[PDB]
Structures are given as C-alpha cells and as structure tokens.
From a paper:
In June 2013, the first case of human infection with an avian [name] virus was reported in a Taiwanese woman. Through systematic introduction of mutations responsible for receptor specificity switching in other human influenza viruses, we found that a single [name] mutation in the human H6 HA strongly shifted receptor specificity from avian to human type.
3′‐[name] binds in a cis conformation similar to its interaction in the wild‐type HA with slight changes in Gal‐2 and GlcNAc‐3 presumably to prevent a steric clash between the Gal‐2 6‐hydroxyl and the aliphatic part of Asp225. Consequently, the distance between the Asp225 main‐chain carbonyl, the Gal‐2 6‐hydroxyl, and the GlcNAc‐3 3‐hydroxyl is increased (from 2.6 Å and 3.2 Å, respectively, in the H6 HA wild‐type complex, to 4.6 Å and 3.8 Å in the mutant complex), reducing the hydrogen bond interactions between Gal‐2 and GlcNac‐3 of 3′‐[name] with the [name] mutant RBS.
Author numbering:
A (entry chain C): 2 to 262, 266 to 329
B (entry chain D), D (entry chain B): 1 to 173
C (entry chain F): 1 to 172
E (entry chain E): 1 to 262, 265 to 327
F (entry chain A): 1 to 330
C-alpha cells in the first residue's frame, strides 16, 4: 500500500568526531575549533613594526655597546625580537645588577627617547675624554666605550676631586638611566686612573640611595680584562631628582631614555617581513578565526586560547549512516 | 542510538533527503520522495548553533604565559612560574578535550531524540489505519492522497475520515 | 522539547494546576479540574533540590586573592601573582557559567522526561478503553466517574471492568 | 528512573539473569528461564568502558606541588606558592568530583534507556498478538514454543503466522 | 463528547529567565539565583571584632611611632586593618624602610600587638639620648620631635661617642617585632658634630640573625628640608632569642617594640566608613550579607564569603519551561 | 496458563553505592573505584636507584662536611633525598649559610656528586692551615675539629697575615658546587689574635661572578659556646670557568668541592621520619609508596615518579552498572 516513513539525513562526509561512549564516529556536519597553522614570520601588530635588535642583545642595545650604533636614536616598538645568537652585549666584563628586572621593565615599554642626561661638563676637574677600552671596540675603532656612559678618569694633575651632578626630572615621563663602578685588578691601576686614598660612588634621589666603593682584585681574563665594572640601572620618576657624587671609580650616566609605558620580548630566528598581523606568537602569525590553538602559549595581540590538543572537533550533525551501494 | 531511532530501529539515513536533518519519505500512487521537516530541523539548528556559540564565548579567555628570565639564584621562583603556567595549561586542555567528548555525546542524543519524536508524532496519528513495517516506516490501510501525506506531516491527519476504508481493507486479507 | 512532551505534543501548560509540576486535567459530567501527581512531583523536587546542593557544596571552596605589595625591583613576581590570581578567576568563572548553562539544558529535559512518563503510565492503563488524541489527552470510550478518574491517577484502573462498555461505543 | 523503565514501570531486577545487563524472561509450555539480550549488553559494555577510559585518559596530567624551603623574608612568595598549589588542588578536586556526580547520573539513564528500548522493540513486534500485563510482561494470545520465543528475542518474530490464532483466543475472553 | 483525562504540566505568572547551552532567555516557572551582586558600602566588625582604623596614618606611620600617629599608640587588636588612601603621616624623617613589603605582609596578619619598652634609654652608657629630635617629625604640640619607638642617639656635649651596647633575652611567649635605623648625614660636618670622628658602625645580632651597616655620607635631594637620610629596619625577635646591639655612632636605637600575636588576614586600602555594625563577610568595597554561592563584588575579603566570579548572573532552573495560556 | 515474555534487567547482591547529582547513596550492580587512599609508609628505590639517607645530619651538615657526618663523606648518587626532621648535626659553628633555600633547591634536582680536593692547603702561602679547628665542631673521635670541606685559615707566628691567592680552573664538563666563608670575631682582640691587624677582606671572582665581603666584628649571643659567627657561602663554578680566591684575612677557604651532575627527572627532598628499605617503586609520596592502578590519590600532593593526580576527595566511584534492585526474599 502507500508508505510514509520517518528518518534522517546522510551525506558523503567521512569526517569523524569522538565521544565519551564512542570513538571515530562519522557525522554529517561538524566544526573544528582549533588552529594548528602558523605563518612562520614576525609581523606588525596594531600596524606598529617590531624592534629587531639584530646582532645585539638587550644589554648591548640599551647600555649602548659601540657595535650597536644602528639602534641608537629613539625607538617605537610593538614588541622586541632578540636573536638568540647575538654576540654584542656587555663588552667590558662585569655584572649588570637586577638584569632580569630590567629586561622585564624594558619589555613593558612601547617607546624610549634618548637624551643627554649628564653632559661631560657636569664633572669639573676630571677627564671625560680619555676613557675607552680595547674590550669595547666599535667596528671602526679598536678602543671605545658605551654611548650611554662615560668612563671618567683623572686629569694629568694627580688629584681626582669630588665631582658632583644633579638632574631634575621636570618631565612628564620616566627616565631609565645607567651607571657603574670600576673595580681595578691592581692597586697600580687604581692610582693611575684615580687619586690616592679611599674612593666612593654615591647617588641619591627622593626614593633611592646608592653607595659603593671599589673592590680591588684580579678576576679571570674576560675580553682580556681582569678588572670588572658593576653596572646599575634605575628609573627616575617624574618630579624626582638625582644627585651624583663621587671621588673616583664612577662610570657616569651620560645618556638616558625618556620611557613610555602588555608587551613581549621574543627570542627567535624568524624573519620580519612587510606584513600585518592581529595575533603574533613566538613561532608564528595566527591568521585564524578558531577558538583554540596548539601553536604557542607565548603571544601578543588578540589570539585563541592555547592548549596541547591536536584536535577539538565538535559535532553539529547526526551520525552519518548513508545507504551502501 | 540511545533513543534508539538513529542507527537503531531506523537502520539508516537518507542521502536523498537534502533539505533538512529530520524528515519524511513517502510513496503513494501519485509519486514518492523525501521531504524534510522544517520546524524540527530549524529548532535543532538554532539550538546546536547556540551550543557552539555558547562554548565559543565561554572559551574566549586566554592565559598569558610570559617571557621572563630568572637568575642563578631564582630557581625557585622560576620553577614556580613554570608549574603555574603548565597548571593552567593542563586545566584548560582538560576543560576542552573533556567538554568536546561530552557535548558530542549529548548532541548525537539530541538528534536521535528528534527523529524518535517525529516517529511518535505520526504513529499516534495513524493508529490502526496504518500498518507498522520495519525501519520507522508505515503502510496505510487506505489510500493516502498527497493532501493526506501533507496532513500527517503538518499534524492535521483525519483518522475518522479513513476509519471504515481501513477496517474493510485491514482484515479482508 | 527533547522528550517531545513539554512545548511539544502537549503544547502549553496549566496555570490552573497550582499544587504540582506534573498533572492531570479531566472533564466529566460532574465537571473539570487540575490535579498534580505527588509521587513524580515530589521525586522531581527531591532530585532538583539535591542537584542544587551538590552544586553549591562543590563550589564551597574559595580562592583567596591577597593584594600584597611589590617593589620596583619586583615587577616579575608582582605580575606572576596577577596572572595567577586572574588565572583562577578565569577558570572558576568558566566553571560556574558553563555548569549553569549545561545543567539548565539538562534540567529542562528532566521535566520533559517526567511529563512523558506520566503520559505513558496513563496510556498503558487505559489501552483501548480510551482514544489517544495528539495532545497527551485521552477521550474515554465510556463514562468515567470521579472514582474512575481518581483510579487512573492512583494507578489502580480497572480495565476489564469497563472493557465491554468500551467495545460497544468504540464500534457503535 | 528517568526513561521510567528501571525501578519504574519495570519494578525490579533479576538475580537470575547472570549473563547480561538487559534481558528477557520467558515462560513456556516447554519451560522457563532467563536469557540476556546479547547485542545490547555488549554495546553498553563497549560504551561504558570507553567512557571510563576517556575519563582516565583526560585525567592523565598531574599538577606538581614541590617542597621548597622559604625564609622569613620570603613570606609573600611563600604564600604565593601555597595559594597557587591549593588553587589547583581545589580546581582538580572539583573537576573529578563534579564529573563523577554528573557522569553517574547519566550512565544510569543510559542503562535505563536500553531497557526501555528493548521493551519497545518487543512491544512493536507483538502488537495485539500479545496481552500486556504489567512490569514489562506480555502474555501471548497464542502458543509460543522456544522457536517462537527466540524469534522475539532475535527481532525476527512473525505476526501474521499467529495473528489468526491470537484473534480467536482473544475473542473468547 | 466523551469524558477526558489529560496529562500536562505547571504554569505560572513568571517572567524570570535562564540560559541553556541550546537556548537563551528561556522563561522558567521556578529558578534560583546563585550569585550575589549587592553590598553594604562600609566596614563592619568581623567575628564581633572591630577593624583598626589607621586614619591619617599609614602603616609605616603607625608602627614606627610617628609623632602625629599618637592616637594609634599603645596596644592594638584587630580583625582587619583599614589604611586610608590619602593618609599623610608615614615616614617623617626621609629614608627607606628596608623590606617594606615583607613587613606589610607580616603585620598584615597579625591580630594583636602589645607595645612595650624593649631598650630603656638607661642602656647606651655615655651618650645623650634626649637631643635626638628633628623639625622633619613634628608632633601636633611641638615643632621638633621623633618616632616614639626609636631613640636618636647623639654624642655627649663633651665628646666622644663610645662603644655602646645593649641586649634583650626574650623570655616571653610571643615574637617581638622591633625597629632600628642607621643615620646617613649630608656632610662630614653633621657626621662629626653629631657622632665622633672615625669609622662608625652599627652591629646587631641574634641566634638566627646578623646585621652590619656603616654610614654612607652624601647629600640626597631635599625631602622635608632634609638632605640627610635614615635607613630603617625591622625584624622579629623569636621567643627564646637574645638580641645583641652594639654601635659606634649613627644608631637610631630601638626604644619600643611590639609583642606580636598571629588565620586569614586583610589590609584594606580604602576610604569607606567604619560603622557600628556587625558582619560575617567583609569585602574591600562593601559588606556581603548573603546565603548565595557566588558573588561578583570583590576577590579581596575577610570572613566566610561567597566565591568571586566575573559573572553578572548565575541562575539555575529548578522549575520547568513556562508556557502559560 | 498463558505464555509470557518479560523485558527486564540484571540485579545482584552488591551493596556498593555511588552518588549522582540527583540522588545520593544509589546501589548499583557494577562500579569502579577511581581514587586510591592506600599507601606504604616507607621509602623505596625508584629507578632502581636508592635514595640518600642523611640520617643524623642536615643538608647543610652534609655538604659543608661536618665532622660527625663522615658516614656520608665522599661520592654520592641518588634518586631523591630523605632528611630526618630532628637531625642534630648541621652548622656546628654558629652563622648563616647564605641563599640557603636556593642551595637546597639546587642540591635537589641533582642526581649525584663526586667529592674532590678543589684547593690544596699548600695553595695559601705564609699562613697557618693546621690551627683551624673548634670544639663547636667535634668529630665523634676528636673533641675539637672542623668541617671536612673548609679550611679555617689563621695566621703564623709572624704578626702579619700575608695576602694569599688561589686559582682553580674548571677544565671539563661538570658544574662544581663549592663553599667558602668569612669569619666574624666577637672581639678586635680575637681579630688581632687570629689575623693581622688592619683592614681585612675576602675577594673572589669568576668570568661571571663577583664576591667582596669584609669582617663585621661584634659580640653575638652564645651558640655552641661561641659568640663569634661565620658567614658561609655557596656557588656553582660552571664548565670552562675559573675561580680566583684572594684574602687579607678572615677567609674560611674552600678545601673540598663537589663535581655536580644535574638530573633529567624530577628532583626532590623529603623531610620525613619514615624508613628506607630494600624495595622498588614507581610512585613515592612524602608520606608513602603508592602501588596502584587508579587515576587519583588522596595521600599526598608531593611525590617523585609517576603518580595519580592528587585530590582531597575521600572517594570517586563511577557507576558502570545499573541501579541494583534485587528481589526481596524473606
Ligand atoms: C663572655 C664570655 O665569657 N664568653 C667568651 C668565651 O666564650 C670565649 O671562650 C671561647 O670559649 C670556647 C668554649 O668555652 C672555646 O674554648 C674557644 O676556644 C677556641 C675554640 O675551640 O673554639 C679554641 C680554638 O683553637 C680557636 N680556633 C682558632 C683557629 O682560632 C677558637 C677561635 O679562636 C674562636 O672561635 C674565635 O672566636 O676558639 C674560646 O674562644 C672567649 C674567647 O675570646 O671570650 C669570652 O668572652
Ligand atoms: C682554564 O683552562 C683553559 C684550558 O687550558 C685555559 O685556556 C684558560 O686560560 C684557563 N683559564 C684561566 C684564567 O686560567
Ligand atoms: C552513603 O550514605 C552514607 C550516609 O548514609 C554516607 O556517609 C556515604 O557518603 C554515602 N555514599 C556511599 C559511597 O556509600
Ligand atoms: C637566655 O635566657 C634563658 C632563660 O633565662 C637562659 O636559659 C639562657 O641561658 C639565656 N641565654 C643568654 C645568651 O643569655
């Protein structure tokens, strides 16, 4: 007789989902929720290109290593790429104190403006011109020094006199500045460069106090130097004032950055091309609309949630049981 | 099935039915075909979509790992950072892998139940005017017009109308 | 509805059945009314209640944020703390919001299931004594006394008792 | 139960049926006994076993607490390590506890659906050849040797074969 | 015409809605709201214990003994602490409280302190202990004063500064919280006028502690007309531990210390009123008096509080889909 | 009688219950217990490698080379460390080991150490090696001794303490964990007596590290009948790096050092008083061995090895069977 039946949809779908009860279940329609695909390059985020530190490390860029002069002016970045194998960093051997806190602080920023904080004339009766090292060559000059610091030495006259400087931050922006403390290997080097007697370096602001005296001894040769320099950083808040005062061994602030304040610092091989991005990870761009990604937990911009899942395929259609021809 | 209609007592699907998820197939002297039930297909589309959108929205919260460095005296705070970031990683990988295994199960059940209810919405209309064959298929004891097939679908089937025609035919055999 | 009953073949509900979630509407020469099924209602209430308390109890533990202070040499751990605290905030906000969304879907179906199995319980009793309309309503092939109605609900319905009276009008 | 079959319209279980989760009880002129429906208990065993393995797998990851000494000038990050570690301990405790509660409710429903679908399978075969007693029990209006019992269990039961025999026996009562 | 019994379900005048994975804005006959979004904007007692109102004083101002923090002086017990945002009286003589954050955490809980004279001025033989005031630290009554918990020790009119010594063996039950300092002058003239000549030191020890600091003379920017500085310190003399002091000059001595008794504790930085009310839940932005499971007010609280989430609503259906006629 | 066919389900004598969101205490036919609360209160070998039992020594007493810790002297290898909660012999001469929490963390995560003589007593010229002994540091045999890995360098009959220098170059392949100290007398009398008069210093450096410290002379509360203190220090000399030691005085010199192999695995330190026996394990919690197949445990969140996820739960029993409604016999 006449037949009326009830049933359901089928199609040539061979796409399978998974279930708590069953595995490898073919269905009629489904949605992948995860992105496993990645342009292996770096791009502009917010239409603001990254800073490629090239052959220089973060210590090398910002302290002002002579071989990093490419990076020297002001800088505006959306993130920082630091090539892993960069060989230009702290050329005159020694420790940059609170290194990790500074890499962190530089990471927070989007812009720095270089300016001359303490002109060489700030220090009377001493030699601004003489101090440079063979451990810190420029490409052109065998002996040079950091473009942000002055290795002040005493003049031909024997005494190194108390030297003093101040800088008042009447500005609207914070100031990242550096300084240091020379530590000769010898009593002979100490007397040649600086006066006779106990020397000191001292600096202070409303919210800071620093104070150090040279520790004199031979450390193993690094860059042919058995002496060391302690480097230091700090941030002059707006409205704050810095007083500098030393009778020797001061490696002085020369140039400082007005600093504008999530951002990242990527250590990476990847190329930086003329391309835009909306999500950048440390292993590539994500040009996607998916909800999850298994690419990398380290990104900047708008990205999907990072999980270790190979697939996250939701089902939206019924089980696919088509007729067998 | 769990409701038992799909991949169950209704052994298969209709590649021939391409305008909906759930439907009717009819045969009568005027012709045969496959006609999807728009209302129960629409309501399932709105619903599954909302499920997809609900999960998408709930899942749009990222944990941001960081590039921070650590000195040779900061092993403890460094490992504290690693376990933190792997912890939220394991917690969200679980939260998604498990939700997808679960929601798929309940989605397949949802379809199985909409087929099943369509099958019952007809069977309570035909009563003994029709004979129940296998695979959720029914053979009428009377002649069913196209406008008959139409009334079964849109729920306005006239049982009394075909009662005496059916009885005479049903046990004539 | 998923089990077909609620906002399905039983199209609407009864603003007149005040005493229960699931119930019977009858009509008679003596009148018409609404009457809940205590067993299925009170067993549903028991369940829903226990779900709500299972949820509330599971959600009892808090996460304690601290608002400690950090120095200007403490940007890393001060941020480590913030990601951490907003991390658990982001997880527990998900857990709640999702659970509620899922459990709402599943609870609406429970009531659907319970209304369906009420209809099946009555249908099984009556058999061919009554005729099953589309809407979960049954038209008796006999005269059903308030005592008769009461028995359908009680689950003590005497089918043979009305069988002969029913065979007549069913075919008459 | 939710599908109404287990501890519902079927009041009790059978300590006698030892080979399956869901089954048939039959009484014959030839004899009586219990036999599990073999197709269905195997599909339930597969399905549940995968559920258990899916869960076990999803829970494979472990957060790791570590015992690191802290000094009296390290109160803040000591507590950061505690609130972090308990924080994950409270997240996993909640997952494993809510999931067990949920999946347990749902696996009871699945068992209760397989019973109801077993019974609906048989009930649609028998039609009016069999009388319905309660507890999911049918009395045949005809004879039924073992071969006939098997045919109901095997889903291959012949309704016309016994339709005449059933109809007269029904008329008599 | 036949008698009818129908099966159906409840309805009601409800307009309350819920969301499900499959549908939004589903009206339902009976629901429960699990999330609390209201609060009393004020601070109330916890466990029938009143909070501590530092008022015009910061935490530093309170426990160091700032002359203008006199109304806070003495014994205190608290259920939590409320430091106002614009509290002006803190460190009055310029300088750095070392391990400030860590001290804030230890104080933070903490439930009671008993203040007592640890080192009487009788200690420190041969030095003047009555001239150590300053225009930087006025009390309300007097122009020049000093912190009530420290003594500024200066050279006897007839020089010099001799080795001075003190000790304290802790026989009590409770840990002792104490403070001291080292003075840092702007000249060698102030240094000479106030202390001897010669190399000065301040040395402090306990069974588990070692301190050593000498002055670092230099001129810092003016703060409260002071170009000199003081480095402040805190510590905790555990029960059974002895404290040995010894100085050469430049010691700001510990005069008063707190017996310190230590649950979960809060320091709220807020400007909300403390009223004569009681509470079971206290939030940094208000009181919660509720039985609900979740709250959307604040992550920071003391007492038994609902769990904090970002959700505007968390409503569970109890009843069923509401379809009235 | 009439022929019957019934549809029904399994039941059994099981009395085992589960909870659900809708109903507590439901009896079911079959279920799995997913959580483990059983434990062996002992410590077992893990990669067939035995742990290290510091016995009556602390971590500090062990690598400084306290005299009473001679049982532990020499090379050691281990899969984890057990340190007894009331071990007496640690830092016998009163004073702080600096960056201690960070040293304990470094020591953990280290599979093994070889002990060797980094600086020989001859390294220092013009000074007295053989007087460097105290009776706050006895061995079991001699009432007055000193750590096995350090020299207390004191002065010779000539009044001056000469400048002394030492260099060690790490030729190959392994980090070296080493210790040194600065002595702080209670007196200037003791200062002058033990060391030359005038300003003193300890200075040490490497390609990447700088250390300068000067004595801090003051009278400190008696500990082990000592009012003086020593500051102890630790550091790790990387491969291909070189250490320079130089001192005017007050130097407690490095004598013996540890070649240090770090591990690929999880390092751990257990502060427990449980015992160590000749047994193997796959899971070691701080409070015992788990020997289980289950997915969760409630024993401890601290472990080394492959372990179930820890949760506070008492029980986690999943239903695999159905509701159990067996027939009522009487
Ligand atoms: C105020 C008071 O009475 N106390 C001290 C008193 O403790 C101290 O005497 C010290 O007494 C202890 C135990 O009684 C030892 O006898 C000290 O002798 C030794 C030691 O064994 O520790 C002898 C040892 O040969 C010395 N070793 C070297 C290499 O010098 C050491 C060492 O010099 C000291 O540890 C340096 O602090 O001491 C004995 O010093 C005396 C000593 O000044 O002072 C009293 O005031
Ligand atoms: C360490 O040893 C290497 C290999 O002999 C040598 O080249 C290097 O100069 C040494 N370092 C020092 C400072 O002695
Ligand atoms: C059973 O009920 C008892 C109290 O009647 C309770 O302690 C237990 O947690 C429940 N569950 C189990 C697993 O028996
Ligand atoms: C500290 O006091 C206790 C009790 O008076 C005493 O036993 C111990 O010897 C004292 N220690 C010092 C260093 O005075």
């Amino acid at each position: 007789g006449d037949k009326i039946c009830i049933g359901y949809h089928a199609n040539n779908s061979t796409t399978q989902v998974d279930t708590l009860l069953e595995k490898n279940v073919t269905v009629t329609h489904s949605v992948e929720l995860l992105e496993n695909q990645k342009e292996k390059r770096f791009c502009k985020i917010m239409n603001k290109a990254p800073l490629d530190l090239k052959d220089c490390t973060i210590e090398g860029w910002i302290l002002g290593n002579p071989k990093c002069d490419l990076l020297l002016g002001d800088q505006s970045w959306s993130y920082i790429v630091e090539r892993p194998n960069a060989q230009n960093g702290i050329c005159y051997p020694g420790v940059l104190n609170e290194l990790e806190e500074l890499k962190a602080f530089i990471g927070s920023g989007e812009r720095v403006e270089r300016f001359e904080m303490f002109p060489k004339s700030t220090w009377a009766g001493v030699d601004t011109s003489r101090g440079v090292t063979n451990a810190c060559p420029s490409y052109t000059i065998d002996s040079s020094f950091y473009r942000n610091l002055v290795w002040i030495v005493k003049t031909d006259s024997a005494t190194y006199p108390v030297i003093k400087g101040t800088y008042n931050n009447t500005g609207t922006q914070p100031i990242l500045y550096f300084w240091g403390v020379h530590h000769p290997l010898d009593t002979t080097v100490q007397d040649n460069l600086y006066g006779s007697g106990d020397k000191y370096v001292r600096m202070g602001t409303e919210s800071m106090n620093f104070a150090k005296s040279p520790e004199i001894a031979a450390r193993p040769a690094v860059n042919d130097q058995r002496s060391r320099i302690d480097y230091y950083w700090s941030v002059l808040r707006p409205g704050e004032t810095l007083n500098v005062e030393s009778n020797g061994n001061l490696i002085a602030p020369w140039y400082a950055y007005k600093f504008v304040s999530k951002g990242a610092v990527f250590k990476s091989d990847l190329p930086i091309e003329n391309c835009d991005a909306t999500c950048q990870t440390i292993t590539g761009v994500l040009r996607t609309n998916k909800t999850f990604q298994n690419v990398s937990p380290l990104w900047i911009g708008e990205c999907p949630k990072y999980v270790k899942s190979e697939s996250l395929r939701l089902a939206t259609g019924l089980r696919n049981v088509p007729q067998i021809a | 099935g769990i409701f038992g209609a799909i991949a169950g007592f209704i052994e298969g699907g209709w590649t021939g039915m391409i305008d909906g998820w759930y439907g009717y197939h009819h045969e009568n002297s005027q012709g045969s075909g496959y006609a999807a039930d728009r209302e129960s297909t629409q309501k399932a589309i709105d619903g599954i979509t909302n499920k997809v959108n609900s999960i998408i929205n709930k899942m749009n919260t990222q944990f941001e790992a960081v590039d921070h460095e650590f000195s040779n005296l900061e092993r403890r705070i460094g490992n504290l950072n690693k376990r933190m970031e792997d912890g939220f990683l394991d917690v969200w990988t679980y939260n998604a892998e498990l939700l997808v295994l679960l929601e798929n199960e309940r989605t397949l059940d949802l379809h199985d139940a909409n087929v099943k209810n369509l099958y019952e919405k007809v069977k309570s209309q035909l009563r003994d005017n029709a004979n129940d064959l296998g695979n959720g298929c029914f053979e009428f004891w009377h002649k069913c017009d196209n406008e008959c097939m139409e009334s079964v679908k849109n729920g306005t089937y006239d049982y009394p109308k075909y009662q005496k025609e059916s009885k005479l035919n049903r046990q004539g055999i």
